[PDB]
Design a protein around this ligand. Structure first.
Ligand SMILES: CCCCCCCC/C=C/CCCCCCCC(=O)OC[C@H](COP(=O)(O)OCCN)OC(=O)CCCCCCC/C=C/CCCCCCCC
Ligand SMILES: CCCCCCCC/C=C/CCCCCCCC(=O)OC[C@H](COP(=O)(O)OCCN)OC(=O)CCCCCCC/C=C/CCCCCCCC
Ligand SMILES: CCCCCCCC/C=C/CCCCCCCC(=O)OC[C@H](COP(=O)(O)OCCN)OC(=O)CCCCCCC/C=C/CCCCCCCC
Ligand SMILES: CCCCCCCC/C=C\CCCCCCCC(=O)OC[C@H](COP(=O)(O)OCCN)OC(=O)CCCCCCC/C=C/CCCCCCCC
Ligand SMILES: CCCCCCCC/C=C\CCCCCCCC(=O)OC[C@H](COP(=O)(O)OCCN)OC(=O)CCCCCCC/C=C/CCCCCCCC
Ligand SMILES: CCCCCCCC/C=C\CCCCCCCC(=O)OC[C@H](COP(=O)(O)OCCN)OC(=O)CCCCCCC/C=C/CCCCCCCC
Ligand SMILES: CCCCCCCC/C=C\CCCCCCCC(=O)O[C@H](COC(=O)CCCCCCC/C=C/CCCCCCCC)COP(=O)(O)OCCN
Ligand SMILES: CCCCCCCC/C=C\CCCCCCCC(=O)O[C@H](COC(=O)CCCCCCC/C=C/CCCCCCCC)COP(=O)(O)OCCN
Ligand SMILES: CCCCCCCC/C=C\CCCCCCCC(=O)O[C@H](COC(=O)CCCCCCC/C=C/CCCCCCCC)COP(=O)(O)OCCN
Ligand SMILES: CC(C)CCC[C@@H](C)[C@H]1CC[C@H]2[C@@H]3CC=C4C[C@@H](O)CC[C@]4(C)[C@H]3CC[C@]12C
Ligand SMILES: CC(C)CCC[C@@H](C)[C@H]1CC[C@H]2[C@@H]3CC=C4C[C@@H](O)CC[C@]4(C)[C@H]3CC[C@]12C
Ligand SMILES: CC(C)CCC[C@@H](C)[C@H]1CC[C@H]2[C@@H]3CC=C4C[C@@H](O)CC[C@]4(C)[C@H]3CC[C@]12C
Ligand SMILES: CC(C)CCC[C@@H](C)[C@H]1CC[C@H]2[C@@H]3CC=C4C[C@@H](O)CC[C@]4(C)[C@H]3CC[C@]12C
Ligand SMILES: *C/C=C(C)/C=C/C=C(C)/C=C/C1=C(C)CCCC1(C)C
Ligand SMILES: *C/C=C(C)/C=C/C=C(C)/C=C/C1=C(C)CCCC1(C)C
Ligand SMILES: *C/C=C(C)/C=C/C=C(C)/C=C/C1=C(C)CCCC1(C)C
Ligand code: NA
Ligand code: NA
Ligand code: NA
Lengths: 240, 240, 240
């Protein structure tokens, strides 16, 4: 049974489309404006190709929420629906989201992290579309990819966390709060959603993920953008 | 209503399969034959991995037209149809097509261009399969990704256009004619097709795109191949 | 007609899931344990990102066999089925499998090989789902991508085969046995399967591919892992 207030859901996706997409434009605008807090046009005249990955993720997520809003405003399951198959839209975004984080701190094993998150979400896509007791077999399989990934990421994050200056360490701390505080919120919501326990309705499931996407991609991207400016402002602008 | 002359459409796709695929084989054959117009086997003994991207695109496009011809010769919607979902086959080709162009001129923001064209086509895939007034919402969303992408590409193209010698500038000019003259022809055909205004029938839509693919991938790849030979013939063969 | 012993098929996939996935964990564990047979933590403190590709392939394949086992244990076609569309799961694995092999021997034209195997499998996906005489048109199209790919790979393999020391040449020989002895076994099984000649039943088709995947990904990955240790033990551990 899925008979929910679509105009409300479409409005929320439309509002999130503007902010997430608009947030991405600022990141790209701010990236190609100066090496750090100054207006230095880099040594080579352009930023490295990976620094723009944070901005593109929000634009990619913002575009998806534009399509989600069209799906809800239509009033049901559109033929090109980005809401019917849960977590399918996140397959194209989360692997890049961890990849952007990995490049920012030059964490090791970027390829391992990419497939860790790439396969974590595909287990979510399979779990959602499975109307049987094996829904949680995929969920358990997905967690087997996430738990080693989360724990290993914490270990490497702390390795890089104590080497940054305190001024630049402030932004990394809040990036970790979003990464290690909200990413594990998606599996928790899956357990309690209508798929699992049943406490959270389908409509409330969409709204909560709308705000989670505002946090994990838009706000997280802003912190990465601000972190990157400070990181380059201490090394390549001050020589330290 | 889709009851069109499939043997004609299959023949056209079959003919385009041979030329596009055959054109790709020449590019690969010509690439691994000499640094420029001579038979110099490069300094490292092999061409860089990206120079072969132009040839692979035609082979990838040629393979797709082999599958399209099988779909039409079958006489309708084959289970593995590359014609039922319009613009879906272009999702795997156009992003590489811009990527090959970006590497040829070492344009900045290659990652931004890739996702600009990657998301431009996905809006086309959604627009086609949407039997409602929101077809043009996806179309408008797709154009929001294409118009900044086209205009920005023109700005960077002209930046690199005035630094090449006139001999090598001739080939770049015609590459721009195809890129800035025919890529915007796809959205124009969408408006006038049976999806939009209704002037162009579905059958004529397939035929026109068959010739557009001959131009944007096969002929465009040839110009890139000839451009690349001249570009390397002026710098690494003459020292200028 | 597909009414086969699913508990047997689920058990085989479950057993292959444990070994293939478990084999991948050893590769990753062994990779990040020493430059060669010693415990040298590399010069830069971490292995290159591509050395871990062999381990990830088995984990990716092992995860897929976890999903295949869930599909069979369910007792038919699960909504998220990795068995309904034959060769679709191999699209994400084989291109990386050749890519891992190409990086191990630093073979040229890695991009050409990737699309050669990527498009070879997509022809298999189309061939399987085509209930007409054009099934073998896709099969023939797929072989047109595989035969040049196989023959070219043999030529480049032998080029790199005579330059390695005999101690390290032993492992390369068996890698070639799997690559040039079992990869062409998949098209042969397609001809004789229920899709083609009809000698091999659908159930026996799953079991044989279960053992082929144990060989082409798990055992092949082990040989690559052992080969890589020896290759680095002769150059960067002995200076030769
Ligand atoms: C736009 C920017 C996007 C950027 C990145 C995109 C990448 C992600 C790709 C998204 C894939 C979209 C698939 C969504 C399928 C939705 C199916 C659906 O809605 O089904 C339910 C719905 C039933 O609902 P009603 O009939 O209203 O029931 C009430 C009774 N009156 O069924 C339908 O409408 C039938 C669906 C028609 C066919 C679906 C076509 C999907 C579009 C195909 C293009 C996508 C290509 C995917 C690649 C593999 C090829 C399948
Ligand atoms: C070969 C080289 C290709 C290289 C790169 C390929 C990448 C692009 C992938 C292409 C995806 C292909 C999807 C096409 C689906 C076509 C559906 C279709 O034709 O439906 C219409 C047709 C109705 O027509 P008729 O019955 O003739 O009506 C007249 C009444 N007598 O419906 C059918 O035939 C039923 C369709 C059967 C199921 C479709 C199976 C599609 C193949 C699956 C493999 C693709 C995997 C995609 C990944 C996501 C998983 C879905
Ligand atoms: C888990 C780790 C995986 C890692 C990597 C994954 C990448 C590969 C992606 C795999 C795509 C999976 C597609 C499988 C579709 C299977 C369709 C199927 O089983 O149909 C047959 C079956 C008929 O059988 P029964 O009714 O039992 O008949 C007997 C009568 N009692 O039909 C059904 O069950 C209906 C199918 C429901 C819809 C299918 C939904 C597929 C899941 C969608 C997510 C995948 C996204 C793909 C991207 C493009 C969007 C389509
Ligand atoms: C079926 C679902 C599949 C969805 C999975 C999504 C996973 C996304 C896959 C990869 C995302 C792309 C990011 C890859 C890393 C970017 C390359 C990198 O690290 O930089 C190397 C280097 C950076 O330059 P430097 O050496 O600093 O230059 C200094 C000048 N002397 O590269 C360059 O030179 C620039 C060119 C890099 C490649 C251009 C971008 C191509 C990326 C491919 C995107 C693939 C996306 C697949 C689908 C997306 C769906 C969301
Ligand atoms: C769901 C729909 C998804 C479809 C989206 C399609 C987007 C395509 C994604 C990426 C396409 C691949 C091109 C990426 C750029 C290639 C790498 C590059 O720029 O070169 C770096 C560098 C080049 O060498 P140099 O440093 O010059 O060596 C000198 C020797 N001392 O790399 C190398 O060393 C060679 C190895 C490069 C990687 C090999 C190719 C792997 C590419 C992955 C393809 C991904 C395709 C995804 C699906 C395709 C569908 C059409
Ligand atoms: C629709 C079906 C599509 C499925 C097709 C599957 C094809 C898979 C596409 C690409 C697979 C990823 C492998 C690409 C090659 C990896 C990059 C590489 O060669 O290394 C370059 C270089 C290695 O470092 P060095 O320069 O040695 O550093 C020394 C320190 N001074 O790169 C790095 O620095 C590390 C970062 C590399 C990128 C991180 C990984 C991102 C890869 C994208 C994966 C895309 C997968 C797409 C879907 C997968 C489905 C199975
Ligand atoms: C619990 C309430 C949640 C509210 C939601 C948040 C909404 C967005 C607001 C920003 C959230 C993230 C901010 C992270 C912290 C950075 C702010 C900051 O101060 O940054 C500066 C500089 O960096 C910045 O400018 C970052 C802030 C810019 C954020 C811009 C907002 C996002 C862009 C959206 C525009 C388009 C949206 C469309 C309208 C919305 C319609 C619904 C860094 O230096 P300071 O510590 O000030 O030191 C001063 C000396 N250097
Ligand atoms: C409006 C009419 C459109 C006609 C369609 C076009 C069909 C293909 C013909 C070529 C079109 C693109 C040519 C672009 C310009 C390059 C031609 C050229 O002259 O190139 C040379 C050299 O480069 C070349 O050789 C490029 C031309 C080679 C093109 C080969 C054709 C494509 C391969 C197809 C073979 C297989 C097709 C199967 C048969 C078809 C069955 C239907 C560059 O130097 P020049 O200016 O001559 O200076 C001389 C001193 N250096
Ligand atoms: C026809 C029978 C087929 C049997 C199936 C094979 C099962 C797996 C057994 C290994 C097969 C591949 C082995 C390849 C050859 C390497 C073995 C070897 O000797 O390696 C050493 C060292 O390298 C190794 O250790 C490689 C072997 C390690 C393989 C570990 C097995 C795979 C991991 C699976 C664990 C988890 C599985 C879960 C349980 C299964 C439940 C069903 C290299 O040096 P040597 O020539 O011994 O010289 C000695 C002085 N240097
Ligand atoms: C309450 C919700 C939102 C967040 C729950 C997770 C919080 C408590 C987690 C997420 C990120 C974590 C931080 C990540 C990194 C470090 C650096 C280390 O050297 C000290 C601990 C410290 C500072 C962690 C403290 C705990 C932390 C803040
Ligand atoms: C009529 C159709 C096919 C093409 C329409 C677009 C044509 C007119 C466009 C496409 C590419 C464009 C060229 C692209 C780059 C340059 C370099 C610049 O320094 C002068 C203008 C010039 C030379 C442009 C002239 C206009 C041009 C030729
Ligand atoms: C293109 C070049 C490299 C040859 C590779 C394709 C060859 C091996 C393919 C092309 C067409 C194929 C044949 C087409 C149809 C059938 C009917 C089937 O009931 C049995 C197999 C059989 C007889 C196939 C065997 C393999 C075959 C001959
Ligand atoms: C019987 C099945 C399993 C395998 C059939 C293919 C076998 C015979 C093939 C696969 C790999 C091949 C080897 C690959 C590379 C070389 C190096 C070359 O300098 C001499 C031949 C030699 C040693 C080949 C001999 C034949 C070989 C072993
Ligand atoms: C912007 C969205 C982000 C960063 C989403 C992240 C989502 C996850 C890490 C989801 C993980 C899941 C599991 C751990 C197991 C079950 C399936 C999921 C998808 C809910
Ligand atoms: C070989 C084929 C090529 C280069 C195709 C390019 C296609 C486009 C740039 C299509 C663009 C579209 C829009 C701008 C908006 C609406 C949807 C499209 C797909 C028609
Ligand atoms: C682990 C699995 C591997 C390495 C599988 C490899 C499969 C192939 C090389 C399959 C090739 C095919 C053809 C040559 C043509 C017809 C279709 C295939 C898929 C059976
Ligand atoms: Na995390
Ligand atoms: Na353009
Ligand atoms: Na092979």
């Amino acid at each position: 049974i899925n008979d929910m207030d679509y105009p409300l859901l479409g409005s929320i996706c439309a509002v999130c489309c503007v902010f997430v997409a608009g947030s991405g434009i600022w990141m790209l605008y701010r990236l190609d404006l100066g090496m750090g807090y100054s207006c230095k046009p880099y040594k080579s005249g352009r930023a490295p190709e990976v620094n723009s990955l944070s901005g593109i993720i929000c634009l990619l997520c913002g575009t998806m929420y534009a399509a989600k809003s069209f799906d809800f405003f239509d009033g049901g399951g559109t033929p090109f629906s980005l809401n019917w198959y849960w977590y399918l839209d996140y397959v194209f975004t989360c692997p890049l989201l961890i990849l952007d984080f990995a490049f920012t701190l030059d964490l090791p094993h970027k390829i391992r992290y990419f497939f860790a998150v790439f396969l974590t979400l595909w287990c979510g896509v399979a779990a959602f579309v499975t109307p049987s007791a094996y829904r949680f077999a995929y969920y358990a399989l997905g967690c087997c990819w996430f738990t080693p990934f989360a724990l290993s990421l914490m270990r490497h994050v702390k390795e890089r966390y104590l080497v940054y200056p305190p001024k630049c360490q402030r932004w990394l701390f809040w990036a970790c709060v979003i990464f290690f505080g909200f990413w594990p919120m998606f599996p928790i919501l899956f357990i309690f959603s209508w798929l699992g326990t049943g406490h959270i309705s389908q409509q409330a499931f969409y709204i909560i993920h709308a705000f989670l996407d505002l946090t994990c991609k838009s706000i997280f991207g802003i912190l990465m953008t601000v972190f990157r400016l400070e990181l380059e402002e201490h090394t390549e602008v001050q020589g330290l």
